[PDB]
Amino acid sequence: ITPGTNTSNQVAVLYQGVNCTEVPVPTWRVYSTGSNVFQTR
Amino acid sequence: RDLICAQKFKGLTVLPPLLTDEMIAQYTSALLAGTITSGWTFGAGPA
Ligand SMILES: *[C@@H]1O[C@H](CO)[C@@H](O)[C@H](O)[C@H]1NC(C)=O
């Protein structure tokens, strides 16, 4: 999720089909993870 | 396993809709309230 490169560079990652417990954070090298997690449907 | 979980292991997924059933129900309730209490005036301008 990006609000646009012309405004800022902060992004939000939405892992599809997880439960905030099997996040990976040669093993899908870690990206910028957010400390504010929220489980959705 | 069931059929839904057996398809996720083959790459086929189902994305959830944006508007849930509760929001559609609230929209229908608002439409019914506008139709009963105002008629057709809420579709043109103010109720
Ligand atoms: C997801 O996590 C919640 C709370 O941790 C739990 O109640 C639920 O059963 C979990 N669902 C699955 C599919 O693991």
Tab-separated table of C-alpha atoms and ligand atoms in Angstrom:
chain	number	residue	atom	x	y	z
A	1	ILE	CA	0.000	0.000	0.000
A	2	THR	CA	1.585	3.247	-1.189
A	3	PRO	CA	0.123	6.754	-0.704
A	4	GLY	CA	2.104	7.975	-3.718
A	5	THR	CA	5.774	8.650	-4.394
A	6	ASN	CA	5.071	12.394	-4.740
A	7	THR	CA	3.959	12.622	-1.083
A	8	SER	CA	6.123	10.232	0.962
A	9	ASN	CA	7.972	6.914	0.840
A	10	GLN	CA	6.290	5.084	3.733
A	11	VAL	CA	4.593	1.848	2.668
A	12	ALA	CA	2.383	-0.795	4.272
A	13	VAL	CA	2.667	-4.519	3.531
A	14	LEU	CA	-0.535	-6.587	3.376
A	15	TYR	CA	0.245	-10.303	3.556
A	16	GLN	CA	-2.731	-12.100	2.017
A	17	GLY	CA	-3.920	-15.213	3.832
A	18	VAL	CA	-2.086	-15.020	7.167
A	19	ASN	CA	-2.929	-14.630	10.861
A	20	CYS	CA	-0.219	-12.178	12.031
A	21	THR	CA	1.697	-15.218	13.347
A	22	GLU	CA	3.339	-16.886	10.307
A	23	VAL	CA	5.080	-13.779	8.943
A	24	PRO	CA	8.591	-14.595	7.628
A	25	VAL	CA	10.133	-11.896	9.846
A	26	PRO	CA	17.464	-17.483	1.120
A	27	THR	CA	14.290	-17.377	3.244
A	28	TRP	CA	12.393	-14.463	1.650
A	29	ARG	CA	14.839	-11.773	2.773
A	30	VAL	CA	13.234	-9.406	5.255
A	31	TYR	CA	11.654	-6.139	4.101
A	32	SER	CA	10.609	-3.038	6.057
A	33	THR	CA	8.300	-4.621	8.630
A	34	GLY	CA	5.739	-2.538	10.504
A	35	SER	CA	5.480	-2.700	14.284
A	36	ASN	CA	1.775	-1.729	14.138
A	37	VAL	CA	0.152	-5.017	13.127
A	38	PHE	CA	-3.592	-5.491	12.673
A	39	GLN	CA	-5.341	-8.721	11.688
A	40	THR	CA	-8.099	-8.323	9.087
A	41	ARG	CA	-10.187	-10.778	7.084
B	1	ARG	CA	-9.370	-31.359	3.581
B	2	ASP	CA	-12.225	-29.357	2.065
B	3	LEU	CA	-12.268	-27.754	-1.388
B	4	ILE	CA	-11.349	-24.212	-0.312
B	5	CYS	CA	-8.091	-25.237	1.374
B	6	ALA	CA	-7.186	-27.673	-1.419
B	7	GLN	CA	-7.214	-24.833	-3.973
B	8	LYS	CA	-4.980	-22.500	-1.953
B	9	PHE	CA	-2.169	-25.069	-2.159
B	10	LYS	CA	-2.373	-24.830	-5.975
B	11	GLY	CA	-2.092	-21.032	-6.168
B	12	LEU	CA	-5.830	-20.355	-6.505
B	13	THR	CA	-7.015	-17.860	-3.880
B	14	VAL	CA	-10.223	-15.918	-3.236
B	15	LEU	CA	-9.972	-12.266	-2.238
B	16	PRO	CA	-12.606	-10.919	0.171
B	17	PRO	CA	-14.977	-8.226	-1.116
B	18	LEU	CA	-14.596	-4.618	-0.045
B	19	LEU	CA	-18.187	-4.162	1.160
B	20	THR	CA	-19.154	-6.820	3.696
B	21	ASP	CA	-22.672	-8.181	4.126
B	22	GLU	CA	-23.275	-5.815	7.055
B	23	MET	CA	-22.562	-2.738	4.927
B	24	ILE	CA	-24.839	-3.976	2.136
B	25	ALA	CA	-27.551	-4.645	4.725
B	26	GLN	CA	-27.149	-1.119	6.105
B	27	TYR	CA	-27.352	0.309	2.575
B	28	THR	CA	-30.557	-1.635	1.909
B	29	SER	CA	-32.001	-0.511	5.251
B	30	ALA	CA	-31.206	3.124	4.433
B	31	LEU	CA	-32.814	2.758	1.001
B	32	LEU	CA	-35.939	1.225	2.549
B	33	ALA	CA	-36.120	3.976	5.178
B	34	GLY	CA	-35.812	6.648	2.496
B	35	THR	CA	-38.456	4.975	0.337
B	36	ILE	CA	-40.923	4.600	3.216
B	37	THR	CA	-40.405	7.917	5.026
B	38	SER	CA	-39.746	10.167	2.012
B	39	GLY	CA	-40.797	8.207	-1.082
B	40	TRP	CA	-38.711	9.374	-4.056
B	41	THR	CA	-37.594	12.783	-2.751
B	42	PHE	CA	-34.391	11.365	-1.233
B	43	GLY	CA	-33.142	10.231	-4.650
B	44	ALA	CA	-33.357	13.703	-6.183
B	45	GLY	CA	-32.427	16.021	-3.318
B	46	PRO	CA	-32.983	16.247	0.430
B	47	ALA	CA	-35.223	13.712	2.131
C	1	LIG	C1	-6.261	-16.887	13.716
C	1	LIG	O1	-5.872	-16.376	14.997
C	1	LIG	C2	-6.965	-16.227	15.916
C	1	LIG	C3	-6.399	-15.596	17.168
C	1	LIG	O2	-4.994	-15.787	17.256
C	1	LIG	C4	-7.617	-17.582	16.172
C	1	LIG	O3	-8.745	-17.407	17.023
C	1	LIG	C5	-8.051	-18.216	14.857
C	1	LIG	O4	-8.541	-19.532	15.089
C	1	LIG	C6	-6.879	-18.274	13.882
C	1	LIG	N1	-7.307	-18.812	12.600
C	1	LIG	C7	-6.604	-19.723	11.919
C	1	LIG	C8	-7.193	-20.166	10.614
C	1	LIG	O5	-5.539	-20.168	12.337
